[PDB]
Amino acid sequence: FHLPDLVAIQRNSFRWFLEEGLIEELESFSPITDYTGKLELHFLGKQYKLKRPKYDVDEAKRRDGTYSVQMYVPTRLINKETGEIKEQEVFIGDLPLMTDRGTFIINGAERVIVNQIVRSPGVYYKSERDKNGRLTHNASLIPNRGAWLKFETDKNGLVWVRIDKTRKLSAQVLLKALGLSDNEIYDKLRHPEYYQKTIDKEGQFSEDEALMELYRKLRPGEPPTVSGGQQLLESRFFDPKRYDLGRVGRYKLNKKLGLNVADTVRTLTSEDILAAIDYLINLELDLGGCEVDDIDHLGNRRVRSVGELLQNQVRVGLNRLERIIRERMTVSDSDSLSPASLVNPKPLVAAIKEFFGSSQLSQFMDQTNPLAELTHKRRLSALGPGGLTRERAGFAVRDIHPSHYGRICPIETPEGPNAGLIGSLATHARVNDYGFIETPFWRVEEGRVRKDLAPVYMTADQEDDLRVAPGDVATDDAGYILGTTIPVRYRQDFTTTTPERVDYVALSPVQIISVATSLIPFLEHDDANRALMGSNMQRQAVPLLRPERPLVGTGLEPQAARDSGMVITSPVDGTISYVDATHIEVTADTGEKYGYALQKYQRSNQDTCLNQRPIVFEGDRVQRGQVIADGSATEKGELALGQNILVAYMPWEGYNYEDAILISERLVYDDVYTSIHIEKFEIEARQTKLGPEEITREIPNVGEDALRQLDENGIIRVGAWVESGDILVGKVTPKGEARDVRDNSLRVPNGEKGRVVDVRLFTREQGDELPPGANMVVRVYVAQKRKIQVGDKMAGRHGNKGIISRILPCEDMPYLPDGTPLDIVLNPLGVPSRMNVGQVFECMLGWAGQLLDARFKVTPFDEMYGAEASRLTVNAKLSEAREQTGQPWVFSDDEPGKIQVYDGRTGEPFDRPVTVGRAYMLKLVHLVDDKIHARSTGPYSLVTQQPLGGKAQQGGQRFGEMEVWALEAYGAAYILQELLTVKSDDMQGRNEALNAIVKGKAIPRPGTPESFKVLMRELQSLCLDIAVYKASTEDYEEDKEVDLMADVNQRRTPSRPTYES
């Protein structure tokens, strides 16, 4: 495993921004001059004097603040004529800093900046076919930032140019306006008669008329001017402030067109335009060395990370700041000025705040467990400000290209509207300084693999002329390739060649998949859809009370846990002198002391615990690189997300039906599958125009039976058990109406209970920053322990999901020929129609490992060594376990994987033996305590007077129009009318219905719902004369307009139904 640091895109991007990303933007804007040319401001953007953060990472986390630094740039103000130079240092802004794990802490929340896959700058050729016409070719020139250029060839052999989105115009105007005589554009072109046709058809242009026509076409309605056209061209293409190719754009232009222009120049020139026209002509005439481009190729696509996006935001803010400076500098006649009083850092601060808090590229961190956290930083998105849109992305962008091999995982994606639009970086891939993904290979000389010669990294376009072999080819002594035919890839195709003709070999068999998919053993025996499901579901598991390693791990577990930064390893090779639940100390051989402090029962973004525990004992010999303490989701060193339990494959009496799960009662009282969840509640004391708000225990209309656990200051005490509807902090507001205070103290929401573990509180006159108009802030933390129960979701690593439907006492479960009852019974109907054959291999190997105490490790794609390696290894292990244990019922030769099982209810054996084993199962975050909701009557909407929606605010269930169609097909008329009026928005019929039900009478007839009246008012407000009419009875009488907005019954109509008494 040659795997380097897994999270290195973020670190490299931020280091680049700090080193040479801010300097380049600060020094491209420095010389700000006014129109008289008397005063100058210079920003010596090379020092930056970064000030150390005032708060640590932990202080920022626990205070709910921001982890950042301050930027200071030196400036000088120069007055012309009279020599006067003033020097000073100005405050520019606050830059949030990146933590040691690659994330940011904004307002006390962990955030991550996502990487974006975009199209690379350069020139792209395409051929389009008319319905009846010939093939016509067009070329598009696209910069990093600026205006786009387009060339097109017509059906008659004419060349046309389009700038941005103006009208089309012949290339002769553009080439003459640029300042080129006929002889040079005749010499540079390879086939001059093809352009001579255009010259003859469109008429020769001189410079003057070329600029005249260019101005006329670009900006119609204004009088043409030569200087106008000159300025227009200079501002359009030749201005560094308005046009930028980039380093990558220049590189791509030089690589394709075969030019030699310098790398420092980043604006368009004449040679590029001449070469693009020549290439278009040659492509039209089939010269031989020309070819159209593919836009989905990974050689035409780029990756942008936090450095580039922050650079763009800084550039925008700096432009606004320069506008303000120029406006302000001229308002004063006498100087009386300093560089400090000239710059205003408000626009830059605002731009940075908006990027880091409200952008759609900065995302709330996924933090359920270390695996989800690790894979959230290696994600690639095709959407955002500068990419695609959901309605425009189609079938071609969501597919798999043959150039993704070893660079993007072909398995891990979402299901639904986001399928194919978010991807994951592969295991060995890395991004170079241009923005292209690379992957490593070993060299092959004369059929010999040189495993001692520094593997080479290659991009998608480089490895198209070479013959590259897969990573599963077998060698005899880490040397010559065995076999006579070898699969290779040549120009995005699969072929076979003799092994004296291959060029490179992939490093490892798992080079093609990601980190989440690399943790599934026996993967090559699974379907791809279920592999997707299992990889996705591995990131929704919950850390358990006592974690445990798998018995059939794959070998990558210790590396997927070292990046989350929760495992402590000793750098010492010494002795341990002090161990405690919160502190560890290790002493070297006369090499001072090393002390570590451990986090205890903290909280993640998704309300899960973040504990840390020690492993070692006092006075222990310790070597370097040895694990000393570990986190909440790791056993010693490696990831541990689930548990090993006894499983049998057979149907029960209907409790296994269609993915349901039947478990035992041992998993409940043995505290298997129990977890800790911590929640946070907040209250704010503000001030009002009526008066201030006070936090106190003198709450009105409350008895001493509801103030037991308050601390005579109005705040609950640590260690108290709180049930639903219990006061946490007591507050009174100064209402205007004797006693003039009202009670709105905060209480726990319905359905929450647990212990109070922290009551940290902040106030003014103590050094704490608070939002304006507020006096104090109180935060309360409540913890609870949850057990497995009927309705929870369980999962395995091979894609098998399920919902628990029964929990049997242990005397009802089937038992083994030694008396041991099983732990879980699974249905065998779900295996053959979905093709998860790897779970049976895993179960059998876990059975053998339990009986041997061995803990095997198997790497994916293990059949390059034999014809059937997995079956042979499992059979040999089971036979060895049978011989070592001494019990003959463990393994049978007639039915290898099956043993006899009895019935716990009657004691009679089942007719045929069944498959039993040890399975590694996980508990997911979808728990039934968070999915049950009910309502009778509650709050209503303000405009439409319909019930509110939402679990957190006593919301109702929506009855859409498909359900209305279903009720219409039944012939139902009264259920529908009761649903539409009495139970939704008939403002007077609701109370009447409720009172009739309580009293026991009949429910009266309804009226007209309020939404119809709202719609009539809205239509009337659009100057439409709409009304409802009652027809005339007799002949010549007129129809009478009915007034809906007038109740005739002068009876009570409250806003919400109320009980009479």
Partner 1 sequence: ATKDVATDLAGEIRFQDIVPEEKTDRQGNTTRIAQRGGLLWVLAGDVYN
Partner 2 sequence: EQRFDYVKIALASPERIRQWGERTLPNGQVVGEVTKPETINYRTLKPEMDGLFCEKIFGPAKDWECHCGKYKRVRHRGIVCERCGVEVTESRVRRHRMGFIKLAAPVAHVWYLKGIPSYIAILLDMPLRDVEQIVYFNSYVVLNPGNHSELQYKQLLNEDQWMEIEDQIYAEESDLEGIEVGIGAEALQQLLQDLNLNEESEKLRQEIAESKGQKRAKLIKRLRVIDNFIGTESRPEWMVLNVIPVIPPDLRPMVQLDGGRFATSDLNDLYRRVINRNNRLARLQEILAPEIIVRNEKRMLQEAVDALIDNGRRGRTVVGANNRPLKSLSDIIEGKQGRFRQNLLGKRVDYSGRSVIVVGPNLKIHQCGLPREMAIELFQPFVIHRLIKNHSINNIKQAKKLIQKNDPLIWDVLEEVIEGHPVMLNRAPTLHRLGIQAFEPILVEGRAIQLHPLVCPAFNADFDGDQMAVHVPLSIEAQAEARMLMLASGNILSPATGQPIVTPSQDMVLGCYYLTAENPGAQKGAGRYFANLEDAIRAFEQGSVDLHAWVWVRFDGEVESEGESDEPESVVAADDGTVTKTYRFRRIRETEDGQRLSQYVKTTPGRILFNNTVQTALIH
Partner RNA sequence: UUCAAAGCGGAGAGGUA
Question: In the complex, which residues of this chain contact DNA (CB under 7 A)?
Answer: 106-107, 109, 119, 147-148, 164-165, 295-296, 301, 357-358, 364, 388, 391-392, 394, 396-397, 416-417, 772-773, 930, 933, 949-952, 955, 957-958, 960, 962
Per residue in 778-812, is it b (16+ CB within 10 Å) or e — as a string? bbbbbbeebebeeebbbbbbbbbbbebbbebeeeb
Asked if 361 and 354 count as a contact pair (C-beta separation under 8 A), the reply is no
Asked if 721 and 784 count as a contact pair (C-beta separation under 8 A), the reply is no
CA atoms of 979 and 616, how far apart (whole Å): 65
Minimal distance, residue 261 CB to partner 1, in Å: 21
Residue closer to DNA, measured from CB, 145 or 742? 145
CA atoms of 515 and 519, how far apart (whole Å): 7
| Residues forming beta bridges with residue 842, ordered by sequence position | none
What residue 930 binds from DNA, partner 2, RNA, none (CB within 5 to 8 A, per partner kind)? Answer: DNA
Element (H, E) at 991: helix 989-999
Residue type at 380 in one-letter notation: L
Q: Which of residues 778-837 bind RNA (CB under 7 A)?
A: 801
CA atoms of 428 and 407, how far apart (whole Å): 8
Residue 922 CA to its chain's centroid (Å): 23
Asked if 372 and 366 count as a contact pair (C-beta separation under 8 A), the reply is yes
Minimal distance, residue 134 CB to partner 1, in Å: 4
Residue closer to partner 2, measured from CB, 230 or 946? 946
Q: Which of residues 940-959 bind RNA (CB under 7 A)?
A: 941-943, 948, 950, 953-954
Site string for partner 1, 286-315 (x = CB under 8 A): x-----------------------------
Element (H, E) at 639: none
| Residues forming beta bridges with residue 450, ordered by sequence position | 443
What residue 1001 binds from DNA, partner 1, RNA, none (CB within 5 to 8 A, per partner kind)? Answer: none
Scanning 13-21, 88-96, 606-614, 1040-1048 for contacts with partner 2 by CB under 8 A, the matching segment is: 1040-1048
Q: Which of residues 812-841 bind partner 2 (CB under 8 A)?
A: 827, 829
Minimal distance, residue 63 CB to RNA, in Å: 23
What residue 286 binds from RNA, partner 1, DNA, none (CB within 5 to 8 A, per partner kind)? Answer: partner 1
Residue (of 185, 173, 390, 352) closest to 271 by Cα position: 185
User: What is the 8-class DSSP label of residue 399?
Assistant: S
Residue 675 CA to its chain's centroid (Å): 25
Q: 57, exposed or middle or buried, with CB in 10 Å at 0-12, 13-18, 19+?
A: middle
What residue 119 binds from DNA, partner 1, partner 2, none (CB within 5 to 8 A, per partner kind)? Answer: DNA
What residue 619 binds from partner 2, partner 1, DNA, none (CB within 5 to 8 A, per partner kind)? Answer: none
Residue closer to RNA, measured from CB, 657 or 1029? 657
Per residue in 494-525, is it b (16+ CB within 10 Å) or e — as a string? eeeeebeebbbbbbbbbbbbbbbbbbbbbbeb
List the one residue from 3, 135, 350, 864 that touches partner 1 (CB under 8 A). 135
Q: Which residue in the block uniquely carries the two structure tokens 């955002």?
A: 384
Minimal distance, residue 527 CB to DNA, in Å: 22
Residue closer to partner 2, measured from CB, 262 or 1026? 1026
What residue 1000 binds from DNA, partner 2, RNA, none (CB within 5 to 8 A, per partner kind)? Answer: partner 2
Element (H, E) at 556: none
CA atoms of 843 and 15, how far apart (whole Å): 47
- How does strand 801-808 pair with strand 660-664? parallel
Output the six-digit token pair for 250.
Answer: 């220049």
Asked if 968 and 975 count as a contact pair (C-beta separation under 8 A), the reply is no
Minimal distance, residue 291 CB to partner 1, in Å: 13
CA atoms of 226 and 229, how far apart (whole Å): 5
Asked if 563 and 373 count as a contact pair (C-beta separation under 8 A), the reply is no
Element (H, E) at 766: none
| Residues forming beta bridges with residue 778, ordered by sequence position | 683, 761
Output the six-digit token pair for 414.
Answer: 């979402």
- C-alpha neighbours within 13 Å on the C-beta side of residue 733: 16
Residue 971 to residues 949, 961, 965: CA-CA distances in angstroms?
29, 16, 10
| Residues forming beta bridges with residue 645, ordered by sequence position | 919
285 is an interface residue for partner 1 by CB under 8 A: yes
What residue 938 binds from RNA, DNA, partner 1, none (CB within 5 to 8 A, per partner kind)? Answer: RNA
Count, residues near partner 2 per rule CB under 8 A = 104
Q: Which of residues 633-692 bind partner 2 (CB under 8 A)?
A: 651, 653-660, 686, 689
Phi first, then psi: give them for residue 526, nearest 5 degrees: -115, 155
Scanning 133-141, 172-180, 382-390, 823-831 for contacts with partner 1 by CB under 8 A, the matching segment is: 133-141
Asked if 25 and 318 count as a contact pair (C-beta separation under 8 A), the reply is yes
Site string for RNA, 389-418 (x = CB under 7 A): -------------------------xxx-x
Q: 38, exposed or middle or buried, with CB in 10 Å at 0-12, 13-18, 19+?
A: middle
List the one residue from 133, 220, 595, 1054 that touches RNA (CB under 7 A). 1054
Asked if 468 and 505 count as a contact pair (C-beta separation under 8 A), the reply is yes
CA atoms of 645 and 804, how far apart (whole Å): 15
Minimal distance, residue 381 CB to RNA, in Å: 6
Residue closer to DNA, measured from CB, 215 or 522? 215
What is the chain's alpha carbon radius of gyration, rounded to the nearest angstrom? 37
What residue 659 binds from DNA, RNA, partner 2, none (CB within 5 to 8 A, per partner kind)? Answer: partner 2
What residue 415 binds from RNA, partner 1, DNA, none (CB within 5 to 8 A, per partner kind)? Answer: RNA
Residue closer to RNA, measured from CB, 252 or 731? 731
Residue closer to partner 2, measured from CB, 650 or 756? 650
133 is an interface residue for partner 1 by CB under 8 A: yes
3-class SS of residue 177: helix
Output the six-digit token pair for 480.
Answer: 């010559």
What residue 947 binds from partner 1, partner 2, DNA, none (CB within 5 to 8 A, per partner kind)? Answer: partner 2
Q: Which of residues 728-757 bind RNA (CB under 7 A)?
A: 742, 744
List the one residue from 383, 627, 633, 921 that touches RNA (CB under 7 A). 383
Output the six-digit token pair for 203.
Answer: 């008429």
Residue (of 437, 397, 392) closest to 419 by Cα position: 397
What residue 135 binds from partner 1, partner 2, DNA, none (CB within 5 to 8 A, per partner kind)? Answer: partner 1
957 is an interface residue for partner 2 by CB under 8 A: yes
What residue 414 binds from partner 1, RNA, DNA, none (CB within 5 to 8 A, per partner kind)? Answer: RNA
Minimal distance, residue 833 CB to partner 2, in Å: 10
Minimal distance, residue 996 CB to partner 2, in Å: 9
Scanning 119-127, 128-136, 558-566, 976-984 for contacts with partner 1 by CB under 8 A, the matching segment is: 128-136
What residue 285 binds from partner 1, DNA, partner 2, none (CB within 5 to 8 A, per partner kind)? Answer: partner 1
What residue 80 binds from partner 1, DNA, RNA, none (CB within 5 to 8 A, per partner kind)? Answer: none
Residue closer to DNA, measured from CB, 222 or 1047? 222
Minimal distance, residue 422 CB to RNA, in Å: 6
List the one residue from 145, 898, 926, 983 that touches RNA (CB under 7 A). 926
Residue 796 CA to its chain's centroid (Å): 24
Phi first, then psi: give them for residue 1023, nearest 5 degrees: 65, 45
- Interface ranges with partner 1 (CB under 8 A): 132-135, 285-286
- Interface ranges with RNA (CB under 7 A): 360, 363-364, 366, 381, 383, 414-416, 418, 422, 536-537, 540, 742, 744, 801, 926, 938-939, 941-943, 948, 950, 953-954, 1054-1055, 1058
